[PDB]
Amino acid sequence: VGSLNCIVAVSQNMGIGKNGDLPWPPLRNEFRYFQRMTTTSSVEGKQNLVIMGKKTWFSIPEKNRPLKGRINLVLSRELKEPPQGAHFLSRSLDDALKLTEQPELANKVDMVWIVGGSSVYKEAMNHPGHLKLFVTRIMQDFESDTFFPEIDLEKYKLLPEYPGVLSDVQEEKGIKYKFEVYEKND
């Protein structure tokens, strides 16, 4: 299995969700960025795995579930089986990551992408080891009821460049945003 990564889009006030959806109206190119990052694998005959909590799964419109071209894993202790259209179910983040090295997945999985929500981002971000955060900074405040955990910059270095990530300010629907990549190894 390859690298472990988180990806998120987050307002200035650290918001990531409101009422089961995003705090901001749809930013179609930002969504396509998310698809490109999470789906693209350099490794032949492998795909990337997405790991998400249950509410994040159900926040993706059913049309777009599962996220195509990726293996979709949902975290839940209440569900007894993966939701319709999902591929796997795990009871903890530790369990999910251990599953990626069982026989079934061991030679199928390239990158692992943690796609939220708040509690899985927090536990991953403090998981010892090599981890990257792909953070889109939405450069406005938006009313939110779900928030991104603190990024400890004494361990997460903001990288000064990354191949394939645009460095300039983006703007859709009158909302400016910019892409960042952070890396720790502890």
Ligand SMILES: NC(=O)C1=CN([C@@H]2O[C@H](COP(=O)(O)OP(=O)(O)OC[C@H]3O[C@@H](n4cnc5c(N)ncnc54)[C@H](OP(=O)(O)O)[C@@H]3O)[C@@H](O)[C@H]2O)C=CC1
């Ligand atoms: N802006 C962005 O980039 C993103 C935005 N979002 C937004 O965030 C909101 C959803 O996130 P959030 O509310 O945090 O909810 P989550 O997606 O984290 O779902 C929480 C549910 O997931 C299960 N769960 C979470 N973590 C674990 C774990 N480690 N092990 C086992 N089960 C776990 C639980 O289910 P159970 O009770 O069944 O055990 C829990 O009640 C929505 O508004 C969505 O739109 C989400 C992702 C990204």
Ligand SMILES: Nc1nc2sc3cccc(CNc4ccc5c(c4)CN([C@@H](CCC(=O)O)C(=O)O)C5=O)c3c2c(=O)[nH]1
């Ligand atoms: N930087 C960032 N991180 C995260 S982490 C994360 C976890 C869950 C949900 C979201 C945002 N909600 C979405 C709802 C529908 C779609 C997508 C995302 C992507 N999707 C397509 C492509 C677009 C299409 O093909 O129409 C697809 O992936 O195949 C969808 O159809 C984000 C999200 C986010 O918005 N931005």
